[PDB]
Design a binder for this molecule. Structure first.
Ligand SMILES: O=C(NC1CC1)c1ccc2c(c1)OCO2
Length: 185
């Protein structure tokens, strides 16, 4: 792809984080802690899942960023409406304000309703995310495989400002402790 020149510097918003997440000083890395991280509760925090938002809000234009997923067994990545539900149980779907892909139990799927099987021959270590606000497109790229297309959501109805979205996943197995990292431009 040729989206690299729309690169944006994403930082994580601590105030939205599940209370078990540990965000680095530079706000560019996040991992699951083994306990509550001693923060107060607030109405912004994702309560049920190990999720966090980027601080940046997008309402126009073309945006691109990259995320490192090396050695993780489970994660969700993409973009969501600023006003998505934070508390309780919910599914990742465009109807609920999410445009995401994930890894779970050795398969990759797009967060459509119902979910869509992805066809990845080279397991990605870094994922590129492209948003075209005006066109209503969210695309995902396999940086490990020379930028090959993973998935395109088209005819997106954003219906609000967008935020970068992250889920580091649970670590019930002891094999999913590694962080998500925002990769340098
Ligand atoms: O963004 C949407 N779909 C495209 C990404 C694939 C989308 C979101 C909400 C809807 C909807 C469609 O239809 C009725 O409520």
């Amino acid at each position: 792809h040729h989206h690299h020149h729309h690169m944006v510097h994403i930082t994580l918003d601590r105030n939205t984080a599940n209370s078990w997440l540990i965000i680095s000083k530079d706000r560019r890395q996040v991992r699951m802690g083994d306990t509550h991280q001693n923060v107060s509760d607030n109405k912004e925090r994702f309560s049920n899942y190990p999720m966090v938002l980027g601080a940046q809000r997008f309402s126009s234009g073309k945006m691109y960023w990259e995320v490192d997923v090396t050695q993780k067994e489970a994660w969700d990545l993409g973009v969501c409406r600023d006003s998505v539900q934070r508390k309780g149980q919910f599914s990742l779907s465009p109807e609920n304000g999410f445009w995401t892909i994930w890894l779970w139990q050795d398969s990759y799927e797009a967060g459509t309703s119902p979910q869509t099987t992805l066809h990845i021959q080279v397991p990605p270590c870094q994922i590129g995310i492209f948003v075209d606000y005006e066109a209503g497109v969210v695309s995902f790229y396999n940086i490990t495989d020379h930028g090959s297309l993973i998935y395109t959501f088209s005819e997106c109805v954003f219906a609000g400002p967008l935020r970068p979205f992250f889920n580091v996943g649970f670590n019930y197995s002891g094999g999913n402790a590694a962080p998500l990292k925002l990769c340098p431009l």
